[PDB]
Amino acid sequence: EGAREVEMDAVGKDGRVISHAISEHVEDAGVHSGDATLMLPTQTISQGAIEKVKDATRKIAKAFAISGPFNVQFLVKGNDVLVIECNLRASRSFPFVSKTLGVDFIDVATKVMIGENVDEKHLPTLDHPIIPADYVAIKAPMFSWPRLRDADPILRCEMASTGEVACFGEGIHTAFLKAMLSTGFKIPQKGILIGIQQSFRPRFLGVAEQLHNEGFKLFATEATSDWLNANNVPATPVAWPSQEGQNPSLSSIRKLIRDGSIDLVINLPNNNTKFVHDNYVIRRTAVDSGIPLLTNFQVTKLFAEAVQKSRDSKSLFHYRQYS
Amino acid sequence: GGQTALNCGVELFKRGVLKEYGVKVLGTSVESIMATEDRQLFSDKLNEINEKIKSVTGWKEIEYEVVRDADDNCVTVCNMENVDATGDSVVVAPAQTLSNAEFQMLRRTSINVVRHLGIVGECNIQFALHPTSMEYCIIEVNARLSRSSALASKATGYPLAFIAAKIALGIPLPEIKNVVSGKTSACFEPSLDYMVTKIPRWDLKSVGEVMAIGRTFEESFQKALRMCHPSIEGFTPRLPMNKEWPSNLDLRKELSEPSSTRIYAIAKAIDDNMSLDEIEKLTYIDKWFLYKMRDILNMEKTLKGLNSESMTEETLKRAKEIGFSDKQISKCLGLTEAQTRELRLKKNIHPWVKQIDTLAAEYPSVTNYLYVTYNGQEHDVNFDDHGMMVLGCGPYHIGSSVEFDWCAVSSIRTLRQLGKKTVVVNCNPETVSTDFDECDKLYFEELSLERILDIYHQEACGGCIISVGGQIPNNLAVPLYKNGVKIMGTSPLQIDRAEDRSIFSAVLDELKVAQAPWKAVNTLNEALEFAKSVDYPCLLRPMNVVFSEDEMKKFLEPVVLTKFVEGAREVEMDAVGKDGRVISHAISEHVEDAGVHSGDATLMLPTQTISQGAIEKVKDATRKIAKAFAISGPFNVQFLVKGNDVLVIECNLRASRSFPFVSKTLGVDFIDVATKVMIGENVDEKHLPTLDHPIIPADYVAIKAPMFSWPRLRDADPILRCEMASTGEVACFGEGIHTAFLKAMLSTGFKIPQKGILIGIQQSFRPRFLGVAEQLHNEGFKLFATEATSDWLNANNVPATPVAWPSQEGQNPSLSSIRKLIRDGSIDLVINLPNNNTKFVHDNYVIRRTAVDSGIPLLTNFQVTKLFAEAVQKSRDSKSLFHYRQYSA
């Protein structure tokens, strides 16, 4: 629990690593690794863990006599580094890593595999990595939508996603906001629907206060709204979609999303089978109305940090040269 | 090993562990020790030989250091008299105001007490003697090495600890050699032909001490005062740090209360013509000392009436002989220090180098343990070595502790291993580096420009290292350089540039290295103008925080303002440069967010939560800085990091307190490398942690934390706030930072909490804290808090037990008291985070004080608290953490 996930993308030649790039997932390890948002270079990984990641990669490449591209995924908690798995082929992050580092990893790999000599002097080998200093890169899905496990094995609601947006920023926060804009969203500035599991309240109150201090009006289902208000974070109560008929007093989510009062939905994973349907409906509504939907806590924190640091929008892309 | 080691040994004896494993306690037996540690047993034992133990204030306090061997030979090695009125006094050795009859009566009792208790080794005994009769009593006996025993060795040249260890093997005193004379044995009592003065160093309750040697009381005493702080001129009616006396001053009140400024108050009382009898009555200081103090002030008056043409050789000679510096004299005559030195040397008035030989020259010594005095007519040594001078750190205080002792030792050793002669200068009697067996000449002397020039030019040293003794030696770089001293390594001109803020900051601009916006202000309005343009809060250097405009108003009773970003990390770069190239470096991360003082920050090495891009920027800025100041030697740069933003905070062009930590963690002595670079000795860079090939431990992390922290109340009344101060060092390795942290907690002598936690936080901090509170509770800690905070926790479904504010105990019988719960063991950890509410600053100080007095861990920072909560989650028992792990590379 609470582990970070790290991707190693590399090219081997005769069992030696002659190009590599280490990326960190924004999301804690566990929620599917294939729709994870990647940051390059790493942001919150200890230097010792990075050394272990490099060392394990060195050994793996030699044990399987690698000549060509490969990928290894790792769990990192503090200094503990655990291999999750290895794919002895190019991964979906090869293009991202290549454009970020200014070196085409597939070109290098293709050369190695056909026996065309390659000059390692300027490549990101394990001994001399390429680490962007002046910018960070983020890779996020283009589109995400919810899926209901209506098949009936378990009752749960998952996210699926597809496509790719990748952007550069001076730091990960501006890269993130650029990726949000690139996916076609407006950066929220009005109101936020907050959905969280009750057991997650202690861990969330900090971020809730922070969003409210940035000037967002907060909305939540009644018990959560009462909880926020009792902790002196102002919040407006709304109804569960399935209970719109049981209280005329409370406003409906659909209506508030339509009038533009809510322009961001945070809807974190929730195991309570009582509200899985409603949570699916809430997520579906956000997506249908074209407003950003955050379903992970680390992503949510990243967003809250990013709006704090930021302002307009044209300024983020302002004809910066990245290399 | 001090009190903790004694208690640990005694405890093992009592449990039968020493008996079970056949381990003999060497030296004084545990039975005897216990008799000296318990007041009742002590009283009982003394009554068997007609000695006894009420108020003894105003009595003279005298102590003796006694050595007794296994064959019952027993000598007194040193005696000391407290000047003022436990171990925070001005002390002189030998005692000055006793008759033979008094001295020998106490000596005799010392020896009888020491025999009756069965001391085999060293012993300290303290007496109170009635000031106008022969009545006395014994205050206490210490049967372990102490501050006093250390002071006695340094004062006499008699190596107590070494001799005590030999005695513990059953070797008698006549069979052990006196290492200073070589020709005689440990079986003798030193005769001193000089006087020693020890003065505590207070935080400007004591944090360090100085010792000075002179051949008049006045020479010794003025020297020792100067050694305390560079703003102290000697014995004068003016305060340290250039502060002026309040207009509402109650002088009699200031005299009757012991405090850190009492000595200056005495000087004022005399100067304002209060009689010495009255001063004696109020201070209990024996009038003999006050006559010497009056003589110093009369000389200041005599000097003020003179000038550079009218002052005679005789008068100047006398002034120097009673401890006047060229600086003091310059102010009286209307000259500069440098003109005064020139005038004095034109009359050929100079000091003389003498040996501390333990025997008052009864026998020739070849000792290289030296001091410098105007009271003489010849030098005791030759000046043919032309050695390399190494300057020590001066007294310990906050931000300047044992780490610089390590750096001195390494530097001195490197020189010796290269066959270079060394001259060491220091005045701190608590240091290991002031060991006359490890250097060729040791001067136990002032670290002032005047006295360093005296020694350097008399020895005709080949060079001087100023880089390994902290701030004191480094601030003398330019003055030394202008007076003919060859400084090794980075040029003094570059040191001056790097530590001039304006020039440093312009150099960073040109290099395109970012820094925290800052300004030097004069008017109060210039401060508001700056604060406006970058928002509150702001920092202040003469380091204090400023939350509002009102708060700024109070502080001016030249000042620099800086904005630190909120929520930033802080990072230290420790490095060695050679010809402007970084050939060794190490980057450490502070646990604490930037802002709370950087000198008691806990360090982690290598970094834990710093982005890779920030690390690259840190390296690049260090590369440029080293080239811009042409660095050859050690240096340090501090940075703020927020995400990818990296801002230089400052640069110190010398070794930092983290050089030992970094050296041991990386397996490379950074001081050895630096010392080699500075003297031109070639070094192989192949295996060093250069910028291009760092050394980054993979299998372990290192942590460096303070040994001891205690709270301080701003009762001075500028602001009402409670801060932490700390001293010492513990460093440990662990598989990760969490286990390193727990090992550091155990190494500092704490038990890892497992029962209950007191939670104190500012109300506005609740949203940010609730997560960690839940996490601690989920680990099985019972939570306690003051009522409103307890209610808040409970309403958020985190169980908590309410307790009372200390100031409100007995106003509610329902609520339990913190003190009681700490005593029963229900609370074994206190979290007390900074709190601005002036209503509860006093209670928060009391809570913090209670935790410290009861010996339970106290966390006062949120990041540290998070680190602890994470660490207990991961951990189990205790022996397992240190389980014979091998740490390297």
Residue numbers in the entry:
A (entry chain B): 1171 to 1481, 1484 to 1495
B (entry chain A): 509 to 561, 624 to 655, 660 to 778, 793 to 1130, 1139 to 1153, 1163 to 1481, 1484 to 1496
Please quote the authors directly.
The crystals of the apo and the ligand-bound forms of human recombinant CPS127 (lacking the N-terminal mitochondrial targeting peptide, residues 1–37; replaced by a His-tag to facilitate purification) contained in their asymmetric units, one or two similar dimers, respectively. Although exhibiting the same overall architecture (averaged r.m.s.d., 1.3 Å for the superposition of 1285 Cα atoms), the apo and ligand-bound forms present large differences that arise from structural rearrangements in domain L4 and in both phosphorylation domains L1 and L3. The structures of the L3 domain are highly similar in the apo and ligand-bound forms (r.m.s.d., 0.83 Å for 340 residues). In contrast, in the case of the L1 domain there are ~90 residues that are disordered (and thus that are not seen) in the apo form and that become ordered when the enzyme has the ligands bound to it. These structural findings parallel the observations that ATPB binds to domain L3 irrespective of whether NAG is or is not bound2042, whereas the affinity of the enzyme for ATPA, the ATP molecule that binds in domain L1, is extremely low in the absence of NAG20. Indeed, the crystal structures account for this decreased affinity, since in the apo form, the entire B subdomain of domain L1, and loop L1β11-L1β12 (residues 654–662; called here the K-loop) could not be traced, indicating that they are mobile or disordered. Interestingly, the L1β17-L1β18 loop (residues 777–793; named here the T-loop because of its equivalence in the L1 domain to the T'-loop of the L3 domain) could not be traced in the apo form. All the residues of the L3 domain mediating these interactions belong to the L3β15-L3β16 loop (residues 1311–1333), named here the T′-loop (from signal transmission loop), which transitions from a β-hairpin in the apo form to a 20 Å-wide expanded loop in the ligand-bound form. In the ligand-bound form, Thr1443 interacts with NAG, while in the apo form it interacts with Leu1325 from the L3 domain.
